[PDB]
Amino acid sequence: HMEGLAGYVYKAASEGKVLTLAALLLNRSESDIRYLLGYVSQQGGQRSTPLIIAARNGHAKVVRLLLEHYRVQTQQTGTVRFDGYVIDGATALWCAAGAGHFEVVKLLVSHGANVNHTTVTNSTPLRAACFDGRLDIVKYLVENNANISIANKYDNTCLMIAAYKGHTDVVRYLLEQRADPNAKAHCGATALHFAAEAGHIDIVKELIKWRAAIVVNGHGMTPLKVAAESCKADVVELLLSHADCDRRSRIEALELLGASFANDRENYDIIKTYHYLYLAMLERFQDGILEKEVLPPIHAYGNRTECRNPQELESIRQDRDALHMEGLIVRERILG
Ligand SMILES: CC(C)c1ccc(NC(=O)c2cnccn2)cc1
C-alpha cells in the first residue's frame, strides 16, 4: 500500500532528491498526493512531514517544489530533533529558522507562512534564529512582522537567549528594534543577568547603552552579583562604573568576586582572591565605618574565622592555604 510509498516520499524529501521525489508523485490522484504529502513519519522519535523534513535539512529545491507545484500546507506541525533533544509543535519555518537555512526560510515566508507560529514551548521561529544567531534570518523575520515580544514558556525573551549565547550582533539588532531590555523571566532574570553570567562584555555594554534596569534575580542577585559569583572579573569592573550602592553593593561584589576565584576550580587564582578581597576590605575601612558581621568557625572550613581588618588580611597574603579557606568562608557568608 501507501504507508510504504509514503516513506519513499519522505525519503526523497529528507535527502533533497528533488528528481526522485517529483518522479514519485507524478500520475498520482489528488486524494493520493494529499495523503503522501501529509503523512507523518517517525524516524527516531522524530515525527515529520516531507515538507517539514526538507525545511529542516535545507533542501530548497525540494522545498520550492512542494510549495510551487503541489501547494502543500505551510502550517504543518511536527516534532523534530536538533542536536539530541526533540522539540514539539514545529512547522517547517521553525526548523528552517533554527537550522540557519536562510534560503529555505525566505521561500517559506514568501509563500505565506506564519512567522509568529508558536511551538509547544511557545517558541517563535524568531526565537530559534536568535538562539542560532543567524542575524540575516533574524533581520528578515523581523522585517516580515515577526513579533519579538513573544517569549517562551518561561518568559525567556529572544533578547535573553541571544544574550546567553554570544550573539552581540543579534542583541544589538534586537535593541534597535526596541526589544524591552528589562523583560523579566520566571526565574526572575533579565538579559543583563544572563550575559553577566556568561562573560559577554560586549553585550553587557549594549544593554547598558540602552538603559537596562538593574533588577534582582529570583535568587536576589544583581547582574553584578551574578557576574562576580560567576567569576567574570571584567564584567564586574564595567558594571561597577555605574550606580552601585555606594559601598554595600560594591564591597559585596568585590568580596564575592574575589571569593569566586578561590571556589571556582576552572578560573582558580588565589592572587586574584587577595587582590579583590583586600580591595574590598579597604572600601570598608576608610571612614575611621562599615564593618563585617562574621560567622563562627566551623569544621567545614577549618576552625577558622574570616578576617575583619586589613591587618588580619595582610597577614594571610602569603598563605595560599589560608586564602583558599577564606574565599570559601567569604562565599559562605554572602550566599549561604
Ligand atoms: C524551551 C525554549 C522555548 C527554547 C526553544 C527553542 C530553542 N531552540 C534551540 O535550542 C535550537 C538550537 N539550535 C538550532 C535550532 N534550535 C531553545 C530553547
Residue numbers in the entry: 0 to 287, 290 to 337
In the authors' words:
The X‐ray structures were determined for six additional molecules (VU0412674, VU0417412, VU0421763, VU0023775, VU0081201, and VU0432623) in complex with FEM1B. The six additional molecules which are classified as chemical shift pattern 3 sit in the same binding pocket. The other six fragments bound to the same site in the FEM1B substrate binding pocket, a region typically important for identifying C‐terminal prolines of degron substrates in a non‐covalent manner. When the most potent non‐covalent molecules, VU0412674 (KD = 0.26 mM) and VU0417412 (KD = 0.28 mM), are bound to FEM1B, Tyr84 forms a polar contact with the amide carbonyl of the molecules. This, along with Phe130, causes this portion of the binding pocket to “close,” locking the fragments in place. The position of Y84 appears to have a significant impact, with the “closed” position providing an increase in binding affinity by locking the molecule in place.
Protein fem‐1 homolog B (FEM1B) is a substrate recognition protein of the Cullin‐RING (CUL2) E3 ligase and plays a critical role in regulating proteins in the cell (Chen et al., 2021, 2024; Hughes et al., 2021; Kramer & Zhang, 2022; Manford et al., 2021; Raiff et al., 2025; Zhao et al., 2021). FEM1B plays a crucial role in balancing the reductive stress response in the cell by degrading key proteins involved in redox sensing and management (Manford et al., 2021). FEM1B binds multiple degron substrates with distinct recognition sequences, which suggests FEM1B has multiple recognition sites for substrate binding. Here, we describe the development of a stable construct of FEM1B, the results of a protein‐observed NMR‐based fragment screen using this construct, and the X‐ray structures of some of the fragment hits when bound to the protein.
